[PDB]
Structure 1
Amino acid sequence: LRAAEHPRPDYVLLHISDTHLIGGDRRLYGAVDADDRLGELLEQLNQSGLRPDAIVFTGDLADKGEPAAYRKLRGLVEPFAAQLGAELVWVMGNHDDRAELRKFLLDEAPSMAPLDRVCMIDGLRIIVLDTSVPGHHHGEIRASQLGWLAEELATPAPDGTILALHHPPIPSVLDMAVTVELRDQAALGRVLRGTDVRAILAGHLHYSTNATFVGIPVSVASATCYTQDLTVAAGGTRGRDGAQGCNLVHVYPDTVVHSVIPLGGGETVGTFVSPGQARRKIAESGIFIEPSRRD
């Protein structure tokens, strides 16, 4: 047998975003059951057998920063993360409330300080940055946050770094996005350029998009609740109950792969290949896949 072109990944992360849960049982904006949409996705991910190292939620967790929404989100997601053996990484969005998030999501004293955090998963560094501005919807990063980020990034991590934030430092194809985009991206660019940041995970746009920023790949996950219709009349915007899902992140020795996971379903087209049948077929094609360095 000959080795496939790439080994199994070093790390696997789920990248979920923009859950927008509300307290109680009403439909989000009277139009979509955000709990049901998120719940269906989590159940599908659970049934798939995926075993990620971490699950990262890139902001807009609660639509109006409601305590009851955070409690519900925690009750849905914590058992999911525990069942998958995954660490859980939460990020602020413009809809969240720092104090209520701390209290009800994190069991931490309420504070209005930016939710900026760092952790390690073995050799991989994850930095959480808070681009939210209390009482506002556009993104900003304070000078103090940039200083902190620069100091953290002064040395690299063995497997490099993933930066998780809400407002992405990239252009949007939707004109309305400019009203609420991350401001003064140049200042963040000066901090990030030349560092070991291998991926910037983001949300906010409610559609799947990717680019680079000062040479670093940016990956924006779409939303679990509702998404932007990119077939809208040019210049406009329409959110819709459709195309929800999340992203899967694979960290390899030499690259990071982002993949869009739409909600499961749709009638089968072509042959369904079971895991067992796939193992047989791959061997019959004369190939083996080299194990992960972290197996």
Structure 2
Amino acid sequence: LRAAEHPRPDYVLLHISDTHLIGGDRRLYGAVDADDRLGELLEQLNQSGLRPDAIVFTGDLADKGEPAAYRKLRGLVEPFAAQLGAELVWVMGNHDDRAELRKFLLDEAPSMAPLDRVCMIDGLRIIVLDTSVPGHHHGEIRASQLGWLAEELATPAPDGTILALHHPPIPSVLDMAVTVELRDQAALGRVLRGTDVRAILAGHLHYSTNATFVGIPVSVASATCYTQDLTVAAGGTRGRDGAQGCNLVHVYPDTVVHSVIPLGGGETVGTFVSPGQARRKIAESGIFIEPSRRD
């Protein structure tokens, strides 16, 4: 048997974004049941047997920062995370309310301070940054937050660092996005350049997109509720009930892979290969996959 080109990943994370839940049972913007769309995705991820180390939600958790929306989100997601054996990482978006999020999602005293946090998953550092501006929809990072971030990044983590935030430091293909983009990205760039940040996870755009920022890969997950139609007349914008999903993040020794998970379904094309059949076929092709260092 010959080894495959890459080993199993060191870490696996789910990257979900822009859930936009509202209080009670009404359709988001009268057009899409955001609870249903998120619920369907979670159930599909659960049934797949995926066992991620962490689940990161990159902002716009509650469409109007409603306590009832946070309570509902927590009720859907906590049992999901527990069933998967995964740590849960929450991030502020422009639609969220810092105080209500703290109270109802985190069981923490209400505060209007930026939701900036750090944690470790074994040797992998996760930094949560709050790009939200209360009462506003564009992104900003205060001088104080940049100082805090620089101080945290003064030393590297063994498996490097994932930075999770809402407003991505990248260009958008949609013109309207500039009205509410992250401002003064140069200042963030000066802080991040040359640090151990291996991935920047973001949302806000409601489509799947990726780029680099000061040499660091940025990955924007699409939304669970509704997504931008990128076949819209050039210059315009149209959200639609379609193409929802999330992302999967695989951290390898030498690279980070981001993959788009659309909602499951659609009629089968080609041959379905069961996990057992796949194991047999791989062996029969004379290949084995080297186990994870964290196996």
TM (norm. structure 2) is 1.00
Identity %: 100
Following superposition, the deviation at residue 18 of structure 1 comes to 0.1
Shift of the alpha carbon at 1:105? Answer: 0.1
- The whole-number CA distance in structure 1 between the counterparts of 2:294 and 2:3 is 18
SS in 1 for 2:126: strand
The 5 A counterparts of 1:249-260 are 249-260=249-260
CA deviation string 1:118-166 (max 9, x = no partner): 0000000000000000000000000000000000000000000000000
Cα distance between partner residues in 2 of 1:234 and 1:278:
43
Displacement of 1:104 in angstroms is: 0.1
Question: In the aligned structure 1, how far is the partner of 2:234 from the partner of 2:273?
Answer: 41
Displacement, 1:31?
Answer: 0.0
Displacement of 1:22: 0.0
Summarize deviations over 1:26-49 as a string: whole Å, max 9, x none: 000000000000000000000000
Specify every segment of 5 or more residues in structure 1 that has no aligned partner in the other structure, as ranges.
none
Cα deviation, residue 24, structure 1: 0.1
For 1:155 and 1:104, the matched residues in 2 are separated by 33
What is the CA–CA distance in structure 1 between the aligned matches of 2:272 and 2:173, rounded to whole Å? 36
CA distance in 2, matches of 1:236, 1:100: 33
Alignment-derived partner of residue 169 in structure 1 = 169
Shift in Å, 1:178: 0.1
Q: Which digits, 9 at most, give the CA deviation of each residue in 1:17-76, with x for residues without a partner?
A: 000000000000000000000000000000000000000000000000000000000000
2:73 alignment partner, SS class: helix
Q: Which ranges of structure 2 fall in alignment gaps of 5 or more residues?
A: none
Distance 1:7 1:149 in 2: 32
Q: How much does 1:230 deviate?
A: 0.1
SS in 1 for 2:253: coil
Q: Provide Cα deviations, 1:68-118, integer angstroms capped at 9, x if missing partner.
A: 000000000000000000000000000000000000000000000000000
1:124 and 1:235 map into 2 onto residues whose CA distance is 40
Which residues of 2 match residues 57-206 of structure 1 at below 5 A? 57-206=57-206
Where does residue 236 of structure 1 map in the other structure?
A: 236
- Give me the CA root mean square deviation: 0.1
After TM superposition, the runs of 4+ consecutive aligned structure 1 residues lying more than 3 A away are none
CA–CA separation in structure 2 for the residues paired with 1:82 and 1:276: 26
Q: Alpha-carbon deviations, 1:216-258, whole Å to 9, x = none?
A: 0000000000000000000000000000000000000000000
Write out per-residue CA displacement over residues 160-207 of structure 1, whole angstroms, 9 at most, x where no aligned residue. Answer: 000000000000000000000000000000000000000000000000
| Counterpart Cα distance in 1 of 2:47 and 2:105 | 25
Give the SS at the match of 2:25.
coil
Q: TM-score, normalised by structure 1?
A: 1.00
- Aligned residue for 1:176, secondary structure, equals helix
Residue 271 of structure 1: how far off its partner (Å): 0.1
| Alignment partners' CA distance in 2, 1:54 and 1:65 | 23
SS of equivalent residue, structure 1 residue 92: coil
* C-alpha distance in 2 between matches for 1:205 and 1:229: 11
